[PDB]
Amino acid sequence: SAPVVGIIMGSQSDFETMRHADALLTELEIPHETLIVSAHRTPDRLADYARTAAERGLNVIIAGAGGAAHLPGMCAAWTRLPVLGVPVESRALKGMDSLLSIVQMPGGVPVGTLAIGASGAKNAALLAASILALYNPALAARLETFRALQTASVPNSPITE
Amino acid sequence: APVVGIIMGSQSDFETMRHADALLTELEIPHETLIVSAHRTPDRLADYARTAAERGLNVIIAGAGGAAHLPGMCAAWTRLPVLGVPVESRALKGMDSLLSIVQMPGGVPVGTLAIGASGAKNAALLAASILALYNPALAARLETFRALQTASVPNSPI
Amino acid sequence: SAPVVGIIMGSQSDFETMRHADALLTELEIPHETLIVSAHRTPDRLADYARTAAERGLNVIIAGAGGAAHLPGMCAAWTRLPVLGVPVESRALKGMDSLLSIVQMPGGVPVGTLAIGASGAKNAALLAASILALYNPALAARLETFRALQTASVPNSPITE
Amino acid sequence: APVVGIIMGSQSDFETMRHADALLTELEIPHETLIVSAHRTPDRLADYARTAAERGLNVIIAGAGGAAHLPGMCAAWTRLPVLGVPVESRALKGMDSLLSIVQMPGGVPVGTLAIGASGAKNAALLAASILALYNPALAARLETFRALQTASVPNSPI
Amino acid sequence: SAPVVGIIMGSQSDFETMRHADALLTELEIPHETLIVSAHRTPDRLADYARTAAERGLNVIIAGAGGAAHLPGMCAAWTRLPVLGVPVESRALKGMDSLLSIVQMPGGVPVGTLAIGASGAKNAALLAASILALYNPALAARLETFRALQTASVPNSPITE
Amino acid sequence: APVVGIIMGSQSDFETMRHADALLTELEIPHETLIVSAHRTPDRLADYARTAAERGLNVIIAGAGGAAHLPGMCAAWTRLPVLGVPVESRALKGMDSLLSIVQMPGGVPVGTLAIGASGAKNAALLAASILALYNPALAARLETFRALQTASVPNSPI
Amino acid sequence: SAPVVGIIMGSQSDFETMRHADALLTELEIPHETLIVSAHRTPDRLADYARTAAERGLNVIIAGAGGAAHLPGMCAAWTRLPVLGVPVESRALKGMDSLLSIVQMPGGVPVGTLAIGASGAKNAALLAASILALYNPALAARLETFRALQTASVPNSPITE
Amino acid sequence: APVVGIIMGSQSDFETMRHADALLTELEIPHETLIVSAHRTPDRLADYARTAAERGLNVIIAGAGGAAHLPGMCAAWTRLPVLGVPVESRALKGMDSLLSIVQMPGGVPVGTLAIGASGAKNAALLAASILALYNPALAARLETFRALQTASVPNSPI
Ligand SMILES: [Cl-]
Ligand SMILES: [Cl-]
Ligand SMILES: [Cl-]
Ligand SMILES: [Cl-]
């Protein structure tokens, strides 16, 4: 059970957001690694991580960062793997800086970007699951089950109290 | 048979989404390029998304502007990876497009790319990266593309 | 007393906002239904709800959603009834994403959009009431009374304490 | 006799609001199209809004740009449904227009449509949807409009 | 001592902000009235207030409002007096809607706009004082004294604790 | 002798501030129209503001773009009412101009007008409203201006 | 040990942010002064401070301000020294007004601008240190040590609890 | 031998960054002007930044648009002062450029200048101010530049 998804983030504070991606991959039984890699404080670690990801058997990278969020884009610069980016909510600008720093990649090097915050982290895991489900029928079935339960769990009317 | 579907809300969107179409062709990825409007052809959208997987599609690239609902509603109906391209709007220059695509609630993802032509090109490349996981010949072509992209950058401005 | 307005929202969390529309329709004695319909998690429910609304006797739909708020627009895609949209305030972007996702409908499919949050929900009910009052003299009188009391309730000067 | 009033703050606004005028005509909805400035003709505005219902108007469509006060002040004076169209401003591209119209406090509503020509067209359609509740012939024409809009969308970009 | 400045606001909730203008005019000994006038709920009151302001001896109007803030602009539509506008901070959009709704008046009808919130209210009073000081030497002296004390009150270095 | 000073940071600002100049002339208000740069001529600015009152100026209208510091720094040095006009900037379309002028901390006010030509025209009118408090002939001309502005608004778009 | 960096700010409230610059210069053993200078309330103090800075032996000025933040720009107008600007987070607009007021200096008079808030203050000190390290080998060594420790302090994986 | 390096992500960026190049030349500061793409030539970037100090560079000026990562990634690899110029982007007019450069977390600074040509010119001037600390001849030329800039401002608009 070698990892097929890598979850990386710039700092421990990012884990409050990125833990939601970690949890969801575990629930879908997707082998993964969850690591801290700082674009700005460990740039050589980042370069090494990204340029060896494919040969290590990783299939998808989920990268989370806030503020001037460069981790997902610089990861994608160094790997042909799909890289998904999660904008971590920032204090002053509430993730608008995080979002624009990740999604506005110029043509040539993509980052598939999800919503600001916890929703984006969960959706990055689900998008990674969708990608892997293309080749893995068991996982495809688990993902379709997840989506069916999601749909069946929506009540018909709200609770008033 | 197409493995990527490129869909967009209107003819005018094609000025942007043609960059995705061109890139898929350059990488020799079989694809279909179609107009599907979330707001004006919602039943067409529902049928398209619902049947995508059984038709053999692997990735959907969806472009729209303004209150851009096409990628999110497509993802609501398929388990396939859906990639969203915010088309530049007249007034708000794609900021409305961008927020209405990227800010999907948890449970139904859309992988969102940059506003405009860059995003369309990158959606095609991201689709290619996804398909390359399973297809060694395509993976080689994608690596060639990235190598040429890197090698072609000049060292000084003219 | 079959419903003539439908209030729909994507989630239970939306009801904290949309309850203000519910309450106001009740105070104006407008028969209505209040339901959860998720654009993203129950898309078939949404399609069915919208395309049968008119034949069921509904006259106005009030739809609330937050973030990438697609519920009001997709409702309007499937019905000729007037659809009013309430942007629910979002955590990071404070409803700016909700607002733009609802109001910026391209030409052909309208959503009449109200303010972000509780004010917008109350005003959606009042706008629905204004629409229905065009054909219902009793309700027209109740609405004019509401507006008169509103005006008469404004004091001449503020309280200092 | 008009059942919809289209009003706008200035002649230049008509480049936008003419799309509402055209649509009402296409659907054969009797209407009046007028200039009423909140800031420059406030008494004209007060009289217009105050007398709208007794004149037989059912819906008011109001377009304005910048610090756009026309729709809100109109709604302050009438119990009729008032629909607001943010006109694209030079500097802020209608973001000022949009916020000054949509963010009405509770008690006095304005149903707000998109910035620019799309919003003007949609205000007319929303007015038509309102009037169709009571008018079977108009409801049929509106359903025809929506059916043609849906059916006319091509399947592939040229 | 008839009022020479009128402070008006849309609601009691606005007074938390506008009280700072009230207090400052009192400290500068400027006779004033402080009233609630709602653009949207008391439009006839507003029209009457603005169109009689000059003949009543008012010289400056300070108007505060939030959200779709129409009070200052509609006041200025009806009076030749200088009208100063204070954007009241709003819940979702933090006064950005208030600010744009007030400052972006088209050419022909001005509103002199101050900062969002308490700072803007204090500055509206000071700007009104500056206007009145043009014709009132006593007040000019009080205002120059205020500004001198303000300047003299700035310490040379911060306190660390 | 001038009773209003119009100042601006650069020649290019005059494309905007000329509208203030024209309006003051139309209302026959004696004024001076000058270039004063906060960033490039800070000593010129300090002397201008410091001496304004003793020179007989009653109002200063200051226009600037980008990180627009001219109105605020002028108000720092004079007790005269200072009115600020955000000049439209190339990239951010005057949003930077607007925030850097209007968001003055308490203690030193700048009465801020709209971004661009509208704001320049309105700064002149606001200056006129201030001066009309003391000058009956000017008050009459201003009332004539407002009456003509109101009366000139057409009733229907062409 | 005469100061070679001046840290200035408009108010005591700014020190909650600017103290981070003060602390960092002390830790890097860079002699500095930390002062309050208000652009709007002490404009003559500001002019004098900036135009004498170079002759006093200062090499870098770090200036912090919020809202309509004019202190860094007006400082740079009066000195040829490099001036670094720190946008202090504002209440309503969360430092967006601070940021734009500082960074958008027209061509001719630069302000090197750092992030909104505490991060920007720490980085202003580090940027000042980088500038001074060009001529000071001891400080260059201390700065390289700071950066090495920073890098070595990043863990490989997050803590889950 | 260059003491300032001007780098930018692409040829199109040079329309902006040429203003920095021109200014350094005007002040006779030896420099190199190069294309280095964070996203397309990340190894070129790493080598450039890592070796900058030992090559004798004192300041790096880096310009980029969109998700602008070039200045921050450069600062990650060098202890030299790095100055960042947000290049105006097509859709968001450099607001994305600006936020992705200025909002660096604590520990790795980038001194950020205005969006566009103004920022490029100011990055060169800020680099000059830094170098003038150590170089009396350059300090004199910079003071001459600032004196001419101040003295050249006209007193009235034409
Ligand atoms: Cl089409
Ligand atoms: Cl007109
Ligand atoms: Cl000039
Ligand atoms: Cl290139």
Helix or strand (DSSP H, E) at H86: strand H82-86
Tokens of F34: 């000058």
Q: What are phi and psi of D63, to 5 degrees?
A: -115, 140
At A49, list the tokens.
Answer: 């991580």
Strand order in the sheet with G112-113: G32-36, G5-9, G60-66, G83-88, G112-113, H111-112, H82-86, H59-64, H4-8, H31-35
What stretch of H or E contains D6?
strand D4-8
> Would the CA dihedral through G91, G94, G96, G101 be positive or negative?
positive
d(C-alpha G101, C-alpha B18), whole Å: 40
Beta bridge mates, H34: H7
DSSP string over D113-125: --SSHHHHHHHHH
Residue H69 is given by DSSP the state -
Tell which C residues from 117 to 156 touch D, by Cβ distance under 8 Å.
118-119, 122-124, 126-127, 130-131, 133-135, 140, 143-144, 147, 150
Using the structure block, give the residue that is written with the tokens 């661009």: F116
Nearest residue in chain A measured CA to CA from B56: A134
- Tokens 């302000």 belong to residue: G111
Q: For chain C, which domains are there?
A: 1-161 (3.40.50.1970)
The number of the ligand nearest the C-alpha atom of D158 reads 1
Angle between helices G71-78 and G96-103 (to 10 degrees): 10
B22 to B30, C3, D29, G103: CA distances (angstroms): 11, 51, 45, 39
* Nearest residue, CB atoms, D92 vs list F95, F150, F155: F95
User: What is the sign, positive or negative, of the torsion defined by CA atoms of E96, E99, E102, E107?
Assistant: negative
Method for structure elucidation: X-ray
Between strands D59-64 and D4-8, the pairing is: parallel
Partner residue opposite B66 with nearest CB, options C93, C97, C104: C104
* Integer Cα distance of F31 and C28 in angstroms: 59
DSSP H93: T
Asked if E144's CB is within 8 angstroms of F79's CB, the reply is yes
Kindly state the tokens that stand for A94: 């509430």
Q: What is the DSSP string of chain G?
A: ---SEEEEESSGGGHHHHHHHHHHHHHTT--EEEEE--TTT-HHHHHHHHHHTTTTT--EEEEEEESS--HHHHHHHH-SS-EEEEEEPPTTTTTHHHHHHHHTPPTTS--EE--SSHHHHHHHHHHHHHHHTTT-HHHHHHHHHHHHHHHHT--SSPPP-
- Contact between G101 and G70 under an 8 Å Cβ cutoff? The reply is yes
3-state secondary structure of F112: strand
- Residue C121 tokens, joined: 């929900």
Cβ partners under 8 Å of residue E38, min gap 6:
C154, E10, E11, E45, E46, E71
CB contact at 8 A, G126 and G150: no
Neighbours of D152 (CB within 10 A): 9
Edge-to-edge strand list for the sheet holding E60-66: E32-36, E5-9, E60-66, E83-88, E112-113, F111-112, F82-86, F59-64, F4-8, F31-35
| Joined tokens for residue E44 | 């006839």
Closest CA to A90 of A75, A101, A76, A103: A101
CA atoms within 13 A on the CB side of F110: 33
Q: Residue B86's closest chain H neighbor by CA?
A: H91
Instruction: Please tell me the distance from the alpha carbon of residue F85 to that of residue C100, in angstroms, as a whole number.
Output: 29
Cα angle G90, G91, G96 (rounded to 5 degrees) comes to: 45
- B106 in contact with chain H, both atoms CB, cutoff 8 A: no
Pairing relationship of beta strands C32-36 and C60-66 according to DSSP bridges: unpaired
Closest CA to E134 of F55, F71, F80: F80
Ligand nearest to the CA of H151: 3
- The span from the first CA to the last CA of chain C, in angstroms, equals 47
In chain C, what residues touch E12 (CB-CB under 8 Å)?
155, 158-159
The closest of H14, H152, G117, G113 to F67, measured between CA atoms, is: G113
CB F111 within 8 A of CB E112: yes
Query: Under a CB-based contact definition with an 8 Å cutoff, are residues C10 and C114 in contact?
Result: no
Q: Which residues contact G148 (CB under 8 A, 6 or more apart)?
A: none
- Neighbour tally for H134: CB within 10 Å: 13
A29, A57, A8, A20: which is closest to A136 by C-alpha? A29
Which token pair is E80? Answer: 């030749």
| SS3 per-residue string spanning H74-101 | HHHHCCCCEEEEECCCCCCCCHHHHHHH
H49 has a chain G CB within 8 A of its CB? no
Judge whether H9 and H70 are in contact, CB under 8 Å: yes
By residue count, chain H amounts to: 158
Closest chain B residue to the Cα of D91, Cα to Cα: B91
- The reply to whether residue C104 touches residue B95, judged by beta carbons under 8 angstroms, is no
CA–CA distance, H38 with H13 (Å, rounded to integer): 13
Q: Which residues contact C136 (CB under 8 A, 6 or more apart)?
A: none
Nearest to F70 by CA among F7, F3, F5, F4: F7
Q: Rounded distance, CA G33 to CA G49, Å?
A: 12
8 Å CB contact of C40 and B105: yes
Q: In which element (H, E) is residue E6 found?
A: strand E5-9
Instruction: For chain F, say whether G74 makes contact (Cβ under 8 Å).
Output: yes
Length of chain B in terms of residues written: 158
- DSSP character at residue D67: S
> How crowded is residue A103: how many other Cβ atoms within 10 Å of its Cβ?
29
Q: Of all helices (H) and strands (E), which one includes residue D62? A: strand D59-64
- Please state, in angstroms and rounded to a whole number, the distance separating the CA atoms of residues E20 and A134: 63
Tell me whether F12 touches chain G (CB under 8 Å).
Answer: no
Angle at CA of residue H108, ends A88 and G113, nearest 5°: 90
Whether the CB of B12 is below 8 Å from some CB of chain C: the reply is no
Secondary structure element (H or E) that encloses residue H42, with its range: helix H42-52
Angle between helices D70-77 and D95-102 (to 10 degrees): 20
Compute, in angstroms, the gap from residue C103 CA to the centroid of ligand 1: 20
Q: Which residue among E84, E110, E130 places its CB closest to the CB of F79?
A: E130
State the Cα–Cα distance between residues C70 and B73, nearest whole angstrom: 8
- E79: Cα within 13 Å, side-chain hemisphere: 33
DSSP state of A1: -
In the block, tokens 């700092």 appear at: A11
Residue H154: other Cβ atoms inside 10 A: 11
In the chain, the amino acid numbered A23 is A
Measured in degrees and rounded to the nearest 5, phi and psi for residue B32 equal: -120, 145
Closest to F126 measured CA to CA, from H152, E107, A114:
E107
Of G103, G108, F96, G75, the C-alpha closest to H85 is G103
Helix, strand and coil content of chain B, in percent to the nearest 5, comes to 45, 15, 40
Q: What is the Cα–Cα distance from H125 to H59, expressed in whole angstroms?
A: 11
Separation CA C48–CA C70 (nearest Å): 16
CA F101, F102, F104, F110 dihedral sign is positive
Q: Within a 10 A sphere around the Cβ of H158, how many other Cβ atoms?
A: 6
Q: How many CB atoms lie within 10 A of CB G154?
A: 16
